[PDB]
Design a protein around this ligand. Structure first.
Ligand SMILES: OC[C@@H](O)[C@H](O)[C@@H](O)CO
Ligand SMILES: OC[C@@H](O)[C@H](O)[C@@H](O)CO
Ligand SMILES: OC[C@@H](O)[C@H](O)[C@@H](O)CO
Ligand SMILES: OC[C@@H](O)[C@H](O)[C@@H](O)CO
Ligand SMILES: [Mn+2]
Ligand SMILES: [Mn+2]
Ligand SMILES: [Mn+2]
Ligand SMILES: [Mn+2]
Ligand SMILES: [Mn+2]
Ligand SMILES: [Mn+2]
Ligand SMILES: [Mn+2]
Ligand SMILES: [Mn+2]
Lengths: 393, 393, 393, 393
């Protein structure tokens, strides 16, 4: 292992800063000072830090306190070298956001959440963030008739397009990344998966600067294939940022260390981010951000162990994934399974639909029974990945 | 109850025709003749019938048999009055489609599946279908490295855009509807949810004639809110057809009768299709198609009971949903919860992002603590829907 | 439907008293005075109230304070007539319980937890409770190597047998009810389902006074059929208490109002509680307790509405379920499907194994293809039940 | 890693013999001659083979045919040396079993099923099997009113006690292993988890020779922790057999190769099977049986590869898990986290309940805030385990 700033490992203030209050109990750890967070992360090898507005500046803070806090915070960044690649807004903790921010049924709350966002774009630009994340955690319902489902999406579009037009208007070098979550805190959250988020962006006026921020655990909460889902985001050129963590099953959002959830899936996630596609295509070159929570059973030595562990796991997996693809038995196994064959277009250069239809060899005279004999050898190919992952090869 | 053709209840041939072979056992019912299917459905009050190419014409059938089968089939339609609103292709039963049709790793199979589709568009147009459904049941994997995820989506786009360009080329009055499914038969199926399907359509060259065919049970297999998901399809103006059935939980695709799964959700599904949105907007006016399977424990009297039951459930639920929205206590409950308030734009006519930011009343001088006191009364509003559903009001 | 004390609707103090703090935000409602909870519930028709030691008496409460609180609460009970059928212990909120109470890895903590339970048995006895509930919320792990799993069960056994032994010694008219939950707050909780709870009880020294307290939503968090789970518990005579609420799928513990989750399942649980088993058998006679949480979106008017909705839902389901079994059409359908034939022993009186295998009629010349022809008509029985549920019959 | 007969790898005939028929398509592979299965498995290092009555002997097999088949298969066994450790009955494939075998609603069917089992006990005994497995696949319902649930358990009990009684009477050296599955093929299956299986066994007349046969993927279909489930079964001394495979989430029964599902869980199951409990306790000593299905995409080369992958995966996990516990660093971490302190009884020798509640140190003056400071360091213990798993240590 041994991470270095070149690796682009970024951590949120709320991750290591998470004190342990869950639904059935109080905090088990003392508050973490943000200046202490910066110094500790930088010592460990992180490249940058992210935060929610209220992670740094209390909801209550007076103008004088905002500036006091920011001066110390900017000093620490200076002292250490950490960048601030992403900034986000808390539109979920305060009681006012109980029915959402942007899709709150109350119009005065929608205006209040949108202004909170607009002000936060100003700080984002001031900090040098390239990405502004939006996780609509309270946008949804417990009951199906609580909302006019079409109006909720119109109100979501108004907020996102107002914010986007504001970025464009000010010429900030910022992009919006939406973050999908199927449920929790709401019984049903709007734009629950990568797909729903991607689809929604296509209905926006300012869609060009809006992309996604998928999170491992979140897609796994709907039982989906995370690599499949980031693949589709990348393919659409909408994978703007990423949150890496662990989740074991469909249950509450666990936010374990990356690699402490579905290990085999984490491996293929790393192969996609590091290696990209077998036949070539797009690559994700942004930060490797960890949106996790250090288990409440553990003290501060567990907090810094867990931060370390996120980075180690990614570097261990990276290593095994480079070895796996480089392996000539793997490349031959890949060749056999038709991995490169899928890259070939289906139609010959210039062939029309009409041409393929009436090509006797592709249909009328095709031997479907003989084509069905093909041994795709997907099991053997899977077996080679696991052995590479197990450090066995 | 009592359905009539005006209700637009359509059934697939494979639904009532399902003989009971599941993964752990053989068929428990005798094959259903298609001409018997047409006569029986029409007697029950159905409006139309749908089918997969191989539901009617065996894979093997010679040209002479195709025409014999179609003549009898067209005669029965004539005899009875049933329309054929949707046609689809089987790209999953034959051993040749073991790695998919359109995204098969084998290029010769991709060509064979696309030609099978092209020929089937011709029959679709011949039959008077307005919708051509595409359920990519074998498009996916069990193992993450079996596929080049970007190439799979390029091969999916090539098939769908070739088929679409073919419709446009021939001037058929047909639209393509993709049908999402999270898993089964594959461990992970591409375009697993409504969202993923919607997003994918936006990357197509011929996206204008491509929409979705969501299925109750399928979105429920990822634990999603079906009404939420069809809401988003409708909002995007992509809800081209629908498959209604029942599913109890995240497990195998059960395909129970509509209403025999998640009842409360079926109720709100019916409220959305019949009533549309509380503040007005889009409406789904296509057929009410039932993609279900009559439980294998039951004989043919259970088959016709189940067909009846699909229609009854929808009409019972429709009744309760009309009463619920018409109810003045419900409309006042709705008013109280802010259902109509969400329809109001957030920004005043002409207000800019800049204007809202610096409006002291929306941010600086906003009383967030007072706005948080609002009783949204969502529980009471839910309670009124259940009582209407229970026939209690 | 108007509840009367005779209905036996019990409510925990923590239910209507739930303030709204969740993992992503703060309390939305002010604390509830216990005196007031008692009075309000008494006006609604509640029969009794239940509580956790710390819901009533603060963790750090001095003795003078404990006496006052108890004085106020016993005054309230005397004034209103509310009974206190169950008392439980909080072994999950204080940070000392972060790895469990009874199965904490730290021995001093295990000792404290058992002491804390023993004292609470005295209190339970002085309050007149018949049931003592144990919900081991912190008993489990996030990670598989955290626990010696055989040793966690010995530790669990030690604690519960010590508590049972003490009950017996003291002559208290108290039974212990264990309550399963699959996950949350821990990634995996010990004794996660009704099956695991019943199984563990059989390894206990004092299992005769140890039974279960299943909760609707907890069984649905593993995707099990709650009606089937309480039927096993009844069948083993181990259904000592029940916790009624609603859950809308496999996700975080929702604790919605009873019937605000899976509706048909709610209906069939009510049918089991009220009508018992179709061929007779044990019947559940304890409190009909609601362990739910008033959505945080709702103000105090919502709290009493939701309290009321629980009893309304239950009474509405009871009315329907009584009509359902009383229907001649329903009884006929039941007959046809073999619901009453299941109740007949398989063997004949004094028919042994050998007698049966040698009986020619039963095996050697049994016509399996003719037997397989039976139309069980389970679909039609199900349709009849739903029609009773919707009150269209 | 090369398996030897000493490893005790057993395979069902239906596993490598699985032809590829699923719910959406036909068989992709030709039938496997049983003689050949035996020989191939013997060359790979299998120790034994298992089967279902009908995998070997057709349902309609005449007596002359049954004798031949048995002759061929016993020849094969004699030639290769393969043992037959478990035999099971098919009570799910024929349409007669559509509502179950033992808990079918039709009494004549229940009789046939019990007869069919009794005969198969004779066969099992003649083959030299130590275990008799019962997987009640058709025992359950799709709908809640289909069964008298107390009566379904009496019927289940009757059947299993009759089979156990008969074993005892005949003097066979056979134990019965019940195998839970939550759903599929039925919507809900009776005795769905290890907990339910263990619980039911305690209500049996002859429960002493009745234990469990848990399957990896089945527990993961309810989202439970398989390692925790087999630990309860071990702890109760009821782990008679095990079925190893992989499952990638809550969905249809995948039956992938062992380790091709949840990897860390596989690792921790292997650690439990090989290393036992950290503080000692019972140990599992039966066959390491694989109940998997070779993906249908793969030809016969894939079948033997996958067979082989199962034993490779298991041996690789064993190597790692032995290294893991042998590591001093790992043992130190274990010490720190209290893995060995869990094993110490909570009470002191001859310390009663009263002694403890009155012990001041344990409760009255226990410093709960100081105890809560303990850093359990479960995260770091977990990181060490994963690092052993990936062989980076
Ligand atoms: O579930 C919590 C979400 O993952 C947030 O942490 C977003 O990433 C930032 O608001
Ligand atoms: O899971 C099966 C699918 O639902 C299909 O029936 C499509 O609706 C038509 O191919
Ligand atoms: O998940 C929370 C639990 O259900 C508690 O309310 C128990 O019922 C009593 O501690
Ligand atoms: O779901 C199928 C089952 O797992 C069977 O293979 C049993 O193990 C034996 O009938
Ligand atoms: Mn998360
Ligand atoms: Mn996140
Ligand atoms: Mn389906
Ligand atoms: Mn469908
Ligand atoms: Mn709960
Ligand atoms: Mn509870
Ligand atoms: Mn299985
Ligand atoms: Mn099995």
């Amino acid at each position: 292992v041994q991470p270095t700033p070149a690796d682009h490992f970024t951590f949120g203030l709320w991750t290591v800063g998470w004190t342990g209050a869950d639904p059935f109990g109080v905090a088990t750890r003392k508050n973490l000072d943000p200046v202490e967070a910066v110094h500790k992360l930088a010592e460990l090898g992180a490249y940058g830090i992210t935060f929610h507005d209220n992670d740094l500046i209390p909801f209550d803070a007076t103008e004088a306190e905002r500036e006091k806090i920011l001066g110390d915070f900017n000093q620490a960044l200076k002292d250490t070298g950490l960048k601030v690649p992403m900034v986000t807004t808390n539109l979920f903790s305060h009681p006012v956001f109980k029915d959402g921010g942007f899709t709150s049924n109350d119009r005065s709350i929608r205006r209040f959440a949108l202004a909170k966002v607009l002000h936060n774009i100003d700080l984002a630009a001031e900090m040098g963030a390239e990405t502004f994340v939006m996780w609509g955690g309270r946008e949804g319902s417990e009951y199906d008739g609580s909302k006019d489902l079409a109006a909720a999406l119109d109100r979501m579009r108004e907020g996102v397009d107002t914010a986007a037009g504001y970025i464009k208007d000010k010429g900030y070098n910022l992009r919006i990344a939406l973050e999908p979550k199927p449920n929790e805190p709401r019984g049903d959250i709007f734009l629950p998966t990568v797909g729903h988020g991607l689809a929604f962006i296509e209905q926006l006026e300012h869609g060009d600067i809006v992309g996604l921020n998928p999170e491992t655990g979140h897609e796994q909460m709907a039982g989906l294939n995370f690599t499949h889902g980031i693949a589709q985001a990348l393919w659409a050129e909408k994978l703007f940022h990423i949150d890496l963590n662990g989740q074991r099953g469909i249950k509450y959002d666990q936010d374990l260390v990356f690699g402490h959830g579905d290990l085999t899936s984490a491996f293929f996630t790393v192969d996609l981010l590091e290696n990209g596609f077998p036949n070539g295509g797009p690559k994700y070159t942004g930060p490797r951000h960890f949106d996790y929570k250090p288990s409440r059973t553990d003290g501060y030595d567990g907090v810094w162990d867990s931060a370390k562990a996120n980075m180690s796991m990614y570097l261990l997996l990276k290593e095994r994934a480079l070895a796996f693809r480089a392996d000539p038995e793997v490349q031959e196994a890949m060749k056999t399974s038709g991995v490169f064959e899928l890259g070939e277009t289906t139609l010959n250069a210039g062939e029309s639909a009409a041409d393929l239809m009436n090509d006797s060899a592709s249909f009328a005279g095709f031997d479907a029974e003989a084509a069905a004999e093909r041994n795709f050898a997907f099991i053997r190919l899977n077996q080679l990945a696991i052995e590479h992952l197990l450090g066995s090869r």
